[PDB]
Structure 1
């Protein structure tokens, strides 16, 4: 099937104070073992928040809700380096012991890698999406995926969401 990473929202409309949930997932990524993404939004329209608790995202907040790369036997490592004030989310996650992971002979190729809450501050048309950044040269529209050999994966689609109209 089609290999891709996508950001999608549970709802397209809402009231001020409502928390829209953006789910980031991957589909059919061969030998997937890690990633890093850069997502941008308009901070005066939406506010990045934990989809569950509702706590405000800070520079070190790592998004929850993933269904892949959770096996402690391969030491998953999470990294967050956001800039909420500028409407920028940048985080990464990967198994450290990829050699052990490859030994199982079965990779986790489809699933959720992040769930992000976006609280509606204004009733206006806005968009959020993956976007390239200087700290990720050679990236695919602000995304980089890696296999269990530690190499960058290429050729997949980056499906942009939004068109959030209100």
Structure 2
């Protein structure tokens, strides 16, 4: 019965050069159809890379998750500031009439994945953040329902995800 979006890492600790996979997971978001998210990371410490290993550019979209994967004319766009460590992206179904008719809303799952290469062994956070670009954000998140309306209330935003609180580093 708790509704949430969370940044979930596959690793708590990661050595230099390792990949840390950040899964953006929703739970119990009624009639979910899409989102706009604004993620922040420290670009001295982590570098976003595709599932093929290639560095994100200013336009690279996060990787696919386990939901938002159906042929409802998905619209995906990203704008990333790699110097500041900001990933702003939107992923949403457009063919909403058809999605509603299928009557099987994607309320729980991984909306997207962002992989990060560890540049430096330092405790660091992957967060969602409010931004002047997204006046409707709730802690950097905008969730949509299958009528195309924002889901304006009733969910937690569980973030930041922290890597390397503990480190394998002799000291």
TM-score scaled to structure 1, two decimals?
Answer: 0.94
Once the two structures are superposed, residues 109-150 of structure 1 have per-residue CA deviations (whole angstroms, 9 ceiling, x without a partner) of: 111111111111111111110000001102110000000111
In structure 2, C-alpha distance between the alignment counterparts of 1:163 and 1:16, rounded to whole Å = 15
Q: Report SS of the residue matched to 1:81.
A: strand
Which residue of structure 2 aligns with residue 160 of structure 1? 159
Q: Size of the alignment, in residue pairs?
A: 164
Which residue of structure 1 aligns with residue 28 of structure 2? 28
- CA RMSD, Structure 1 to Structure 2 (Å): 1.1
Report deviation, 1:65: 2.8
- Kept in 2, the 8 Å contact 1:9–1:161? The answer is no
Q: Report SS of the residue matched to 1:82.
A: strand
In structure 1, C-alpha distance between the alignment counterparts of 2:101 and 2:123, rounded to whole Å = 48
In structure 1, C-alpha distance between the alignment counterparts of 2:24 and 2:84, rounded to whole Å = 20
In structure 2, C-alpha distance between the alignment counterparts of 1:39 and 1:117, rounded to whole Å = 12
In structure 2, C-alpha distance between the alignment counterparts of 1:122 and 1:54, rounded to whole Å = 17
Unmatched 5+ stretches in structure 1: none
TM-score scaled to structure 2, two decimals?
Answer: 0.92
Report deviation, 1:15: 1.4
Report deviation, 1:60: 1.1
Structure 1 residue 116 corresponds to structure 2 residue 114: yes
Q: 1:95 to 1:163 in 2, by over 3 A?
A: closer
